[PDB]
């Protein structure tokens, strides 16, 4: 069906005895429309670019209220069942032509400009413009289509916003950069890591958040005026959830690689159980050169929205000292492939990226929780259930469960370098196991069924569901002093005025139990 539908509203019922205005416009409109395209005959209703439909305002009360037209008659346009600009009555002849010209452009022969004067003048006996596409027209067409995820039609409009124009960059510049990212994330094959790094640098305005493996090659009124200059389109990622959603998509896809195999990867998952065994010669001596490379590749330790200008700052004097640091991440080397626990965790991440790109959403979240808990809870993860009454540290702990464990329980998880305890002290530290999991909740939203189900699962799997924080009130003392009125014949206040509520006053509900009256205003927005 035609996406553009022009609705012509008029009231000709009252003028059945004496036409005044309703019939005057019909005579001119019916004679001009056919000439500009070359109530109406059905044959000529199919060659038009928009659906011309007429409705009587003074015939149906339900429809009259929906449009809510202050005047009569007036032309109202529509596009994919959405309100558009409305042409008010009493306008000049130039205004009418303008409205029709834009109506036929949204749907996307026509009369050439050289023969426009004769068509309009000759149609008045019964009793296009040279401007190119409007800037707002293209922007309004791309904002709505991106939700549909087009493949071939999206590329065309992307190329028609920058060519031999170089005239509008403060308005259309924001959408141009984000439009290219969607196209790159639509192809079946994995996107190019190098291509994404260059594109994302401009949007964020800094390369510090990007991984080191994809970073680029290594007066008085002027000095103080450069402090408020921030390079980066942050406004697009704060007041537009649609725009901010695409940002999380790139983070998930960055964990993927190029030289990978689906069959090989699948087979290796089962073999490497990540137990106390230093991986058998069966697994260590069965890895190809392609897989080895992937494992060693860099990944974003922190999200893109965290530490965008101070990521390179060291964190040496932000740690805690403790001789007791038991962990499974100990094999005489910091290398990924030189650890059994780390090796298993890595494999999971690879498969998660492929599933998300293909379309599998529910299955993708399963691997993310698997890996996050693997390194957190230790090798003991096969037991897919709640903690077996082993949650220590609670008030009035039972002695039965204390004797059912040993030193094994004391071992803490974490990442290779840091641990759980280090993260508690330093708020800037992080590890990939958390960045990957956090990149998925925002990508699919917070109200998504699957996201909601996975969010609650983590609480029960970690054995901490039903936590109630305890916080005490704060002191009632505040700065300043009591109200004081200046003495003398000059009545004036010193610190505070009459409208001052002390910190020891009762609640407003008890002071005004009557509440607003029936005749009171329900909107104090004066």
């Amino acid at each position: 069906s035609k996406p553009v539908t022009v609705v012509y509203a008029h009231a000709s019922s009252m003028e059945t005895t004496r036409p005044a205005s309703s019939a005057s416009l019909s005579r001119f409109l019916s004679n001009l429309l056919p000439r500009l395209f070359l109530l109406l005959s059905p044959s000529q209703r199919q060659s038009l670019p928009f659906n011309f439909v007429t409705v009587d305002v003074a015939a149906e009360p339900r429809l009259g209220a929906f449009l809510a037209l202050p005047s009569v008659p007036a032309l109202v346009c529509f596009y994919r069942k959405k309100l558009y600009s409305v042409l008010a009555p009493g306008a000049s002849d130039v205004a009418l032509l303008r409205f029709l010209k834009e109506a036929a452009d949204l749907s996307e022969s026509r009369v050439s400009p050289e023969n426009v004067a004769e068509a309009v003048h000759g149609a008045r006996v019964a009793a296009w413009a040279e401007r190119k596409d409007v800037q707002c027209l293209l922007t309004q067409l791309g904002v709505a289509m991106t939700r549909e995820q087009a493949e071939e039609v999206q590329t065309l409009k992307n190329e028609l916003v920058a060519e031999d124009r170089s005239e509008d960059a403060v308005l259309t510049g924001g959408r141009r950069l984000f439009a290219e990212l969607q196209l790159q994330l639509t192809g079946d094959s994995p996107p190019d890591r190098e291509a994404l790094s260059t594109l994302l640098s401009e949007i964020l305005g800094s390369a510090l958040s990007l991984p080191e493996s994809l970073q680029p090659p290594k007066g008085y009124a002027e000095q103080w005026a450069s402090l408020y200059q921030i390079e980066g389109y942050w406004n697009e990622l704060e007041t537009s959830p649609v725009c901010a959603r695409l940002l999380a998509k790139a983070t998930v896809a960055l964990f993927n690689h190029e030289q990978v195999n689906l069959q090989e990867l699948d087979l290796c998952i089962d073999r490497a159980s990540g137990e106390d065994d230093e991986e058998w010669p069966s697994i260590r001596a069965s890895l190809s050169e392609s897989l080895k490379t992937a494992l060693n590749a860099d990944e974003p330790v922190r999200p893109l929205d965290e530490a965008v200008h101070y990521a390179h700052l060291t964190m040496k004097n932000e740690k805690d000292f403790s001789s007791l640091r038991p962990s499974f991440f100990f094999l005489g080397s910091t290398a990924v492939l030189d650890c059994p626990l780390r090796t298993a965790s890595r494999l999971r991440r690879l498969k998660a990226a492929r599933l998300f790109h293909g379309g599998a959403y529910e299955e993708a979240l399963k691997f993310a929780v698997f890996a996050y808990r693997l390194e957190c809870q230790g090798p003991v993860e096969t037991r897919r259930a709640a903690a077996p009454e082993h949650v220590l540290g609670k008030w009035r702990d039972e002695e039965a469960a204390l004797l059912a464990v040993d030193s094994s329980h004391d071992k803490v998880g974490g990442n290779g370098t840091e641990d759980l305890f280090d993260q508690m002290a330093c708020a800037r530290a992080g590890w990939p196991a958390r960045t990957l999991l956090m990149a998925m909740y925002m990508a699919l939203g917070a109200k998504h069924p699957a996201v909601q189900r996975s969010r609650a699962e983590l609480e029960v799997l970690l054995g901490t569901d039903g936590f109630v924080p305890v916080v005490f009130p704060h002191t009632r003392a505040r700065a300043g002093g009591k109200p004081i009125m200046m003495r003398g014949k000059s009545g004036k206040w010193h610190w505070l005025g009459p409208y001052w509520k002390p910190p020891w006053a009762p609640s407003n509900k008890a002071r005004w139990p009557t509440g607003p009256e029936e005749w009171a205003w329900s909107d104090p927005t004066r």
Partner: protein, 62 residues
């Protein structure tokens, strides 16, 4: 084949499912209330002023 060991497997598995469903419903209602509060005009106080609550009478003497 152990009869006592298998009993604990079912008890723990069933308990996990009950918590997951309960938590999901609790979070849904928790966020629903906050959304409504952040989409209404602030209520302007119009009750009696606090003119008598300024001065107080604490314990006399020491």
């Amino acid at each position: 084949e152990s009869f006592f060991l298998s009993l604990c497997e079912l008890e723990q598995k069933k308990r996990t499912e009950r918590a997951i469903q309960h938590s999901q419903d609790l979070w849904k209602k928790r966020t629903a209330a906050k959304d409504a509060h952040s989409e209404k005009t602030p209520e302007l106080y119009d009750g009696p002023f606090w003119l008598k609550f300024w001065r107080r009478k604490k314990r006399p003497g020491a």
